[model samples]
Target: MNLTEKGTKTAKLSASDRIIYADNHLIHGPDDITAYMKGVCYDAAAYMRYLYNAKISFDQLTSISAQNWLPVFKFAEGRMWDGRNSLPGGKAIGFCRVKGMEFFHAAVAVGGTEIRAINGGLLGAGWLHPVDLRKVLTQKNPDGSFKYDGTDIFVYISNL
Candidate 1:
């Protein structure tokens, strides 16, 4: 993604984005924001301009009721990074099936090839404890079913 025009640019995040990314520990989230993920906006420059024109502060980026910025970020730096690549620490969103339920979950990666589960989703983990990606993906539940049904997506926010 860094090779595309929308891939390698800088933008001053609106205010709420400051806290959302900060409070969430950049990639270490303690809560799930999937319900509010819009996954739109690839123009970092345009979003920067839109932020000021709308007078939205970095903190305003937390407003799920308004335009959400997380998705825009996902579209920007987020890419299809999995076991095939060495991933860096950042926001990781992917699919996981626990017990008998499958859901799209988020996490924080660390030490590359590892991720800490967020909002209590994968590997039955919560908080931000680091776990090996390869191990978890192939891990089997009590029912003999794989924890992750498919490849999980990874995020790399260059400007966050």
Candidate 2:
């Protein structure tokens, strides 16, 4: 797909947009989706550290980020993990498939999905699902080390 098509598919413009809510601890930008993912991945890794209440170094956090990038899992064969399954303040470890939207279309055999032409930021938050390693890291840091703690946001730039 062309850049415009890719942007439209990523943006999800047809949906009613919602405000991207975050705090001082959070980061947002027109092109900071990578940072957003990094933040969330850090959060997941930190949660792992919190389980043990240990101090994790920035170097460790970078390592954790690398761990998140490792393609050790596959969508069709990836297993979903629930943190709550464990005792002592357990929670769910969410999983997302990278290139999932593309996979969705391929899985459905519906041809390429239509790209909507709309305002870039108007698509809003909560309109996307993570894909592959990107999706997995966004939802849960694969490494047990500490990383950023915040929501990962991305703005589709199809209009450009």
**Shift of residue 39 alpha carbon in model 1, Å:** 18
**Highest TM-score among the candidates is held by which one?**
1
> What does the lDDT read for residue 82 in candidate 2?
28
User: In lDDT terms, how accurate is model 2?
Assistant: 0.24
My TM-score estimates for the predictions, one after another, are 0.41, 0.21
Q: For model 1, how does the per-residue alpha-carbon lDDT over 80-159 read when each residue is reduced to its tens digit?
A: 44344566544433333332332335444444677645344443253335567676565444433343436333233223
lDDT of 2 by residue, 1-160 (tens): 1113322232232222211221112111223233233334323323223222234333443344422422321223423322212111211122222324111111100012111111112211121322222222234344321122243221111100
> Which pairs of residues collide in model 1?
14-57, 14-58, 15-57, 15-58, 15-59, 16-58, 16-59, 16-60, 17-58, 39-71
Top model by lDDT, which number?
1
Query: Candidate 2's error at 46, in angstroms?
Result: 3.7
Clashes of each: 10, 10
